[model samples]
Target: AQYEDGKQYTTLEKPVAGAPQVLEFFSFFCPHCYQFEEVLHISDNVKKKLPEGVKMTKYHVNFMGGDLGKDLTQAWAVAMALGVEDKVTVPLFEGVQKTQTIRSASDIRDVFINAGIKGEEYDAAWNSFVVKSLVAQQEKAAADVQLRGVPAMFVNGKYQLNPQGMDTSNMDVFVQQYADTVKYLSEK
Candidate 1:
């Protein structure tokens, strides 16, 4: 696990300091995050290219949607608690960014409902102790990462990928470059 850091990456001052983790910090309100998944459609390719035994995790920044930021973060927690990200995430993004309809917690809850999660199950997970803890943990980690923008990725909590020196002009090029940086940092 070795890398030369210059334009493409930077070492974190206070890394998460644990097992290899590809942590992404993003917000539902951010158009870039929306396009990364909803438009460019590179999520699956990137996931398939991830190094073995290393998992990609996410942090929903609670600074974008005003007071609703916390609500969106909690909604993410509920999705994880129910293991329904496959069902909930993109739909939530679609509702939020594409349609601009998710304006409150109730609106966010509707996305879960549309995902086939029974309203009762959604409500239960939304207020569960574990979900609350997860949201809090993400919120705490938010400050630790010194996040300046959305769609930022941290590998092993030790390295942060910088978009410099990479071609972002085309979808294919961007996906390859992004995934390549992730692959490189995972071993570091």
Candidate 2:
């Protein structure tokens, strides 16, 4: 299903076509997700070096931590639209990971304010962009993709990175396999 630009997401039908998008499904409150920080940070760098038609996008799962996590998800979407996702990701992760303190929408907004983003801008990003639309896209993707967990991959919406023929529990190998999967799909 096609998602409206500003509408909140309730479903995801197919993948977005730009460079082949790698969708990473995650939750802010999952300690496993927090512990996954180093790998994800490196993966972000890996995204920069991906092939011309290959790109990476993230989906923040909002099953835990209630409205606060939902608020962060909204802010994240705005950051994505503004091209500042990289600027906020690690800090957001750390704010929760180190202190386990990211417990509400305000907590997330506070982190944004502390990170050089002005309060008004942060509030606007969370309320207007993040809440209204971004989080919806993520939720839709999860439903459509039927994702089993974070660190998941959808190459051109063709094949997902799973433990089938390739071993995916290893983060580095999984990422490499993802890139290779994109190449294989693109060539087809």
Candidate 3:
């Protein structure tokens, strides 16, 4: 893994302590992010390259405005709350980006049910106060970070890691750039 000090990423105004955390700011409705899904999963290849103590999180951004933003944001939060994000991530993306079927909460629930999520489990997580609270928290965080767009990466809650205007058509290269930045920062 290799990275350019300034071109590939910008340092955070305020850095935090402890292990570096990598957060991917994404939205299911984002076509580019949908394209990025192939490399963004948790896997052995990724785990082997990541530095020790580093953590990765997927944050569904709500910068879309209106219902599309609200619905999908809540959708991801609910999926995580139900502990079915791993199960629903691909299907949800496919349902929305490919089939153009998933739209609202109920539509998301249907997708979940079809994905083998039990009705009771869905109800419990969807309506939980905790889930709503977490969604609210994420909304505030996206705002606090001044999120510009989906498919952006933040390291250690501050540094924004992007390709510095380089061509990202080759996702393999794009993903490798991200891995390089994370590995570099984790060693610091």
Candidate 4:
């Protein structure tokens, strides 16, 4: 906290990636995260402008809603495992935000089912070691950061983009600044 001003990025205490990558700490149920994907499209815009080979990874937070947080994160891992994250992201948020009825694994399973993932495939990945480990990894990472808020962008595992330090008044400007700042930090 020595130099916590002006710049739109803060350096982490320790590195989290060996190569250039943007690690986003987010919660599926967080409306802020949902808005970014559903309307803002920060992921797509940023991904397009990011340097080649630089990947953006999402780490789900498990501290928001207790067991439900962990459960939703597991479903996320399952969707990720089945390569259907794009289809489930908005749907999960809608159920949580719009319907306000996502409480159990069964509820999560239905979302995946509608996303074209067979119940059998979902069950397989849900029970597999990979998905379990992915959930654990997400939980660990989320807890690691005594996070300030959702949808935090950490670049190259070292620098975190400071949203308050960027253009928040305008959507396009903010997104552009976000992508630009992330790109700049990744080059460090």
Alpha-carbon local distance difference test for all models: 0.80, 0.61, 0.71, 0.79
lDDT of 3 by residue, 1-188 (tens): 34565677777666544412766678888887776674544232345678767667777877664687777788788877767778888888888889888777788889889989898887887778988987986776666667788777777765776655444777666566666666776566
Query: Candidate 3 — which residues are off by over 4 angstroms?
Result: 14-20, 39-46, 165-170
Which sequence of candidate numbers ranks them by TM-score, best first? 1, 4, 3, 2
**Candidate 1 Cα errors over 4 Å, as ranges:** 1-4
Q: Score candidate 3 by lDDT.
A: 0.71
- Please, what are the lDDT tens digits per residue for candidate 2 over residues 18-51? 4236566776666666655555353554465567
Where does candidate 3 have its weakest 10-residue lDDT segment? 38-47
How far residue 54's Cα lies from its native spot in candidate 2, in Å, is 2.8
Per-residue lDDT of candidate 1, residues 62-174 (tens digit): 88988888899998888877888888778788888888888889999988887789999989888899999989878877777778788788887788887665678887887
Least lDDT summed over 10 consecutive residues: which range in candidate 4?
1-10
For each predicted model, how many residue pairs clash, with residues at least 3 apart or on different chains?
Answer: 1, 9, 0, 0
Query: Which of 1 and 3 is ahead in TM-score?
Result: 1
lDDT of 4 by residue, 69-137 (tens): 888888888877888888988888888778877888898889988889998999999999999998887
- Runs off by more than 4 Å, candidate 4: 1-6, 17-20, 144-148
Per-candidate TM vs. native? 0.92, 0.72, 0.84, 0.90
Question: Model 1 lDDT vs. the true structure?
Answer: 0.80
